[PDB]
Amino acid sequence: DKTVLDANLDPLKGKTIGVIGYGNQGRVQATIMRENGLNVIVGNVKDKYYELAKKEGFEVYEIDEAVRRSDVALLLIPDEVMKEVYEKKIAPVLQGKKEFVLDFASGYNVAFGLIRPPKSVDTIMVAPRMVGEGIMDLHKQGKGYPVLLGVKQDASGKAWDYAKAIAKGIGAIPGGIAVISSFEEEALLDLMSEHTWVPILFGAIKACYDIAVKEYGVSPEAALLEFYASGELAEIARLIAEEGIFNQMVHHSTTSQYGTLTRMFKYYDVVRRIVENEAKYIWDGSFAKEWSLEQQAGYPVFYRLWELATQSEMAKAEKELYKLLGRK
Amino acid sequence: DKTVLDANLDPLKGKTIGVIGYGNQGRVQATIMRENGLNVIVGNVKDKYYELAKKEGFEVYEIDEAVRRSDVALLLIPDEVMKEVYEKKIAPVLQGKKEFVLDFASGYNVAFGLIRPPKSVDTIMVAPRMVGEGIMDLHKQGKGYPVLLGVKQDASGKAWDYAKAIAKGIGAIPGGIAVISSFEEEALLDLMSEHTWVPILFGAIKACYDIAVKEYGVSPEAALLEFYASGELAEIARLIAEEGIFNQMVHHSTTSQYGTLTRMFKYYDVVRRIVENEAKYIWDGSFAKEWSLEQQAGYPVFYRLWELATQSEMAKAEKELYKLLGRK
Amino acid sequence: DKTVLDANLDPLKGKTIGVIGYGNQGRVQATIMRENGLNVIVGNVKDKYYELAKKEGFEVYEIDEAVRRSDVALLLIPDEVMKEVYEKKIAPVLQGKKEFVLDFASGYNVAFGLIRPPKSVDTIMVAPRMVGEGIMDLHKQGKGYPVLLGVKQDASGKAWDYAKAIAKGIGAIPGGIAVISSFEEEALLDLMSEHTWVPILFGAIKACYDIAVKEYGVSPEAALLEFYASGELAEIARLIAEEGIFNQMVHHSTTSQYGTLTRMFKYYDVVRRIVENEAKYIWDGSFAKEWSLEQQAGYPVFYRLWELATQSEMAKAEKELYKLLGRK
Amino acid sequence: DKTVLDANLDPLKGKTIGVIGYGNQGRVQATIMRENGLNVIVGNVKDKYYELAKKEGFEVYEIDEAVRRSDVALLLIPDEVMKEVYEKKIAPVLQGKKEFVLDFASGYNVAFGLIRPPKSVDTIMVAPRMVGEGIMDLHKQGKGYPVLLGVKQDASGKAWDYAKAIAKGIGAIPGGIAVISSFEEEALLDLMSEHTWVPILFGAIKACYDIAVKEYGVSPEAALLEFYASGELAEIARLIAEEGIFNQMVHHSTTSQYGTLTRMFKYYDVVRRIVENEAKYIWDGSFAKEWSLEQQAGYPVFYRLWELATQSEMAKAEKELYKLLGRK
Ligand SMILES: NC(=O)C1=CN([C@@H]2O[C@H](COP(=O)(O)OP(=O)(O)OC[C@H]3O[C@@H](n4cnc5c(N)ncnc54)[C@H](O)[C@@H]3O)[C@@H](O)[C@H]2O)C=CC1
Ligand SMILES: NC(=O)C1=CN([C@@H]2O[C@H](COP(=O)(O)OP(=O)(O)OC[C@H]3O[C@@H](n4cnc5c(N)ncnc54)[C@H](O)[C@@H]3O)[C@@H](O)[C@H]2O)C=CC1
Ligand SMILES: NC(=O)C1=CN([C@@H]2O[C@H](COP(=O)(O)OP(=O)(O)OC[C@H]3O[C@@H](n4cnc5c(N)ncnc54)[C@H](O)[C@@H]3O)[C@@H](O)[C@H]2O)C=CC1
Ligand SMILES: NC(=O)C1=CN([C@@H]2O[C@H](COP(=O)(O)OP(=O)(O)OC[C@H]3O[C@@H](n4cnc5c(N)ncnc54)[C@H](O)[C@@H]3O)[C@@H](O)[C@H]2O)C=CC1
Ligand SMILES: O=C(O)C1(C(=O)O)CC1
Ligand SMILES: O=C(O)C1(C(=O)O)CC1
Ligand SMILES: O=C(O)C1(C(=O)O)CC1
Ligand SMILES: O=C(O)C1(C(=O)O)CC1
Ligand SMILES: [Mg+2]
Ligand SMILES: [Mg+2]
Ligand SMILES: [Mg+2]
Ligand SMILES: [Mg+2]
Ligand SMILES: [Mg+2]
Ligand SMILES: [Mg+2]
Ligand SMILES: [Mg+2]
Ligand SMILES: [Mg+2]
């Protein structure tokens, strides 16, 4: 199938590599690669992270100076401002090149056309799915992790070879796997989660609390303990990742199984409709517009919602309680 | 407030205690109490668990023989068959008593009237919220855990004193806390979760998979990795339990925060309606009827759904994949 | 294709066979097989049918005694009570075996999990589609008939070989055919008919009668003669089975063809919706629950409907008329 | 209650005050305060208003120069551009301070997060409800007026003391009153009016005119005279402010009272729904976004609507008429 369990490391040996940033990924992937036998450099904004990077023994020039020396570059930085940074300080230099290769962690800014490098640059993606600390939590075990790979532009007939070369250049395969997928799929997926089941889950919990309290005379403490103040969800998620989502429920009671299955097959259509709506909203590029404008206005809605959420009853009760249990 | 952080241990010292069962709770609570300085006994069906109980040094008679010797009894056994067991082998003996006390882990069978002991028995509840192994995972740390307490019938003016006595008799407070609550609240809560956000979550995930695959040319492996085959959810749940549900999201990107909050406040009404419907269905006693009948018929629906779920596309793909990653 | 026109008879020669029942199928299939050169026995409730079976020269022990002697067993008895009979008088004995094979006529009780034999028994189906008398009405002609075959559990790598062996052991192929199909498909099909076009047909006839009488001043006799008191439908059905459903209509008038076709293509969506609803109701296992409970209550609805139907106007008129025509 | 009828003047005596602007409020409040015995200064854009300010005897430096000298600052300028002005010319200087206090007239830019001063500055509000000329029209009478007060950030445990100090520093209490209220309430209120009853009123008048003319053959002049070209509304509003909204209607005829009351209680739900929608739209921060973007695009909609309104029939007729009556 489309999977790839291991591959070569030929094109990247002999070349210099440009790593932009020393955050979560940047540090991890960079240290890994240095330890994989390659000549690498770092580009960073001269601040605390720069202190830490030069600490760990990585020569760090300015961004553009690291792009002049390298024939490859990894832009391991945020998604909300990368546009301007690329426009001012990277595009000029890049125009001062002929054979180059650029790789990202996310496909947001490219899938939607906010960044359109020239045709003289092979354009690719390599994206994992962790938060970043799990990857050292796996590397010290000598394991490997899974990732997604994509190619946007090939001007060398070699983008895929560089793709798998990089893949092995970060310690994913062998030990994990590597999937090949467009920039578009990656963005679509990373967003669907952030728009569909996470917020639905949270709203459902909030509603259960509000209902139980204001309509059957229950104490906030008990509600919080049942719903999320207990680590039940965490163990469930672990068992899911280990055994399987359904096989997991065998460790539950028959009553729970019955209710859960019935209600699942009873509400599948509604959420399906919702997911359709949101995925369509995304595929078209509307959400990117919405978000970019909300940046350009001053983040008002962001502000007001962050306020409302924290000034809700549930949050205050959680505050009192977490205080009681010593939890910070 | 209604909370209780510590209390006495007076009524239970000098009396014998009857522990019915040696499963997860039974073993844990029983060993704890023995180690808390009390004279205890065990009643069990003579099978593997009986071997393990007599192994760990607990004299174990027959059930009814343990109820004749004890003035207290803890029925630490399932919720689906306990009815018959109480009718045949416990009610007679109990009628052969005057001052007795009975406590449960769950309020299902009592809140709905499937078990109505005489008026010569103080009736109570003590219910934690773990799965059971976390409690030793906390006891070896000398900590304490939270629980719920309830009283159904008082024929001694002392049910609450026995309640807190038991509470401390199992190593919850001091170290955790103890909430007081009817049998009804406990059942309502344990069920709302099993009917509202768990199945909704699962259906949403399933729908995201189905959509992404059958409508945007996406490979199954990537979908599974993004949604649940990765341990993302587990870390999120842990951070929730530690910091707070909302404060958790600070460790995410602004884009995720924005989308999540907007969509949460956008879909809150729908799930609210759903939760209303289900909670009402429960408060009335309809679900208990449904479930009892489904038992009396031969568990057909249970069977067919357990089949359909496992014969779905997502499950088969998860099978192939988990095999690849070595996960059992 | 999946069809099978003939096969072997090897595994069943040398073994003893257990036939449970001497009703329509039991007698027919048993006599056929005896005449096909096999050593067979019979198990039956000692009543009139037992008299008839021992009459026709089949040694008949008790049920369980016939299962102890046989390595195969055919449960040729009803679907509504077979559960208890299997639980009490068959499951014990079967537990007293290692290599066994069990076959049914219908898949109701198995497809829905009301009967779950051990894993040490190959489980199969062989189901024809007649009412039973047509099969002798074909055997004396040396023909063969069609059937469905299914396998639920294979503990021998041989369930299919036994399947076709049995198939030929009853005189179906060669002469007819044999289709392979799950238990589930068989039940689904046998029920869809009993829920979709039969009752719709009957209700349509009833409605035509009621309308014609109470709204255009027509005589009951004429209505009954036109609709069903005449053998028109029978000849139509015969021609359907012989030539084909559509090619049949050539023997009609052009007017009939035109009206029929137009109205058929005009009402196809409605009945489609209905059929969807009912098939879904079945696939899930709800109907089995409904029916089992209606048994457990005392067949009240059954009773009241059997009353209403017979106390309707159409039935009384049919009574008077059939009396006139000498029809019993 | 929350009201405050008079308070102290202690913290502001000995300190210098920074007044930004010399418009309606700026001039009024500044002259008042100077006349209340305080050392004050002015910051202004060097234009006509600057001429007038230096005319009236207020030393006026540049904006930032007035913020360097003052330990307090009052930003008495518009709400639509204040953002940039604060970003460029005020934030730097303010960063060059430790103990500072800032007060506004409106809470728009702060309630929605368009301006977030540091935590080393106590942030407050003092907002009246006039248009500004009424305040001298009251001061020469030695009266006092009502205002709203708010505190956004306290880094001194003294924000409220400065609040009431300022309050008395402008001649409101004693003589009027002072209410305490968040920035949020002030903005919400100032906007609800501008979105709910003003535009509804205007649309109702417009519709009455259009209807009367185009459907019962009436002359424009009469319609205009009845509806608003007469000063009826003004006298009604005055009586409202004086006596009370309802007690006002006693000076009317019984017929008017009856019709008005009935129709009021008959249409209360509709407008309630409308008001809910708009208030919700505001609380969330959507309107601020809308307005900021409409600025960033070039005020197109503003333009087109200002055109349509003036090119309507009613406006032209009003033009002809007001000309007739000599009204400019
Ligand atoms: N939890 C996470 O942060 C994960 C990030 N990703 C993706 O990788 C990218 C981020 O990777 P990380 O660096 O590990 O996360 P991060 O949030 O720590 O990235 C911050 C980095 O960007 C640099 N930076 C910040 N502001 C800058 C500015 N104004 N100008 C120039 N440089 C600036 C900083 O040097 C810093 O190293 C994102 O695009 C994301 O889609 C993928 C998986 C998880
Ligand atoms: N994950 C869990 O199992 C938790 C259980 N509870 C509640 O506690 C009760 C169950 O406690 P556990 O024993 O720890 O769970 P369990 O599922 O391990 O219960 C098995 C025990 O029940 C006894 N038993 C089982 N079948 C029996 C039968 N036919 N006849 C006589 N005795 C039989 C056995 O002695 C066995 O030890 C339930 O009511 C549940 O509501 C509360 C929190 C979590
Ligand atoms: N003729 C029909 O109505 C059709 C029957 N089938 C299927 O075959 C099976 C029945 O086969 P048949 O015997 O030919 O129909 P049947 O209605 O004549 O069944 C009566 C047989 O069941 C046995 N029996 C009845 N009550 C019993 C009891 N309380 N305890 C023990 N044994 C009892 C008797 O030995 C009797 O011979 C059904 O499951 C049906 O799904 C399939 C095609 C047509
Ligand atoms: N009738 C009104 O306009 C009232 C105003 N308010 C609130 O008070 C504030 C306005 O108060 P006023 O000064 O009396 O109204 P205003 O409209 O006369 O304010 C204009 C002032 O802002 C200065 N200014 C204008 N454009 C500038 C620019 N590009 N750069 C720097 N400075 C500029 C001018 O020097 C002028 O003094 C607003 O925030 C409003 O919410 C409250 C009650 C009524
Ligand atoms: O909600 C609960 O605590 C569970 C139960 O079976 O009672 C584990 C699912
Ligand atoms: O910000 C992202 O990209 C997250 C993801 O879905 O992987 C953490 C939320
Ligand atoms: O209904 C009838 O009798 C038919 C006719 O053509 O008249 C044969 C169909
Ligand atoms: O509309 C009018 O002129 C009023 C009347 O009573 O006629 C005063 C209200
Ligand atoms: Mg994301
Ligand atoms: Mg993600
Ligand atoms: Mg439960
Ligand atoms: Mg629970
Ligand atoms: Mg049938
Ligand atoms: Mg049939
Ligand atoms: Mg305003
Ligand atoms: Mg106003």
Short mmCIF file of C-alpha atoms in Angstrom, two decimals, chain A residues 83-84 289-300, chain D residues 83-84 292-293 296:
data_model
loop_
_atom_site.label_atom_id
_atom_site.label_comp_id
_atom_site.label_asym_id
_atom_site.label_seq_id
_atom_site.Cartn_x
_atom_site.Cartn_y
_atom_site.Cartn_z
CA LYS A 83 3.37 34.97 5.79
CA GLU A 84 4.96 38.35 6.48
CA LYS A 289 -10.38 34.14 5.39
CA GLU A 290 -12.36 34.39 8.61
CA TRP A 291 -9.26 33.76 10.71
CA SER A 292 -7.00 36.12 8.77
CA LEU A 293 -9.51 38.93 9.13
CA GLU A 294 -10.00 38.26 12.83
CA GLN A 295 -6.25 38.77 13.07
CA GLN A 296 -6.43 41.99 11.06
CA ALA A 297 -9.09 43.45 13.37
CA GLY A 298 -7.52 42.96 16.80
CA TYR A 299 -8.71 39.57 18.03
CA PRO A 300 -11.93 40.93 19.59
CA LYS D 83 -6.06 52.55 18.40
CA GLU D 84 -3.26 53.62 16.05
CA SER D 292 -13.37 47.76 11.97
CA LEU D 293 -13.42 45.96 8.64
CA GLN D 296 -10.42 48.98 6.51
#
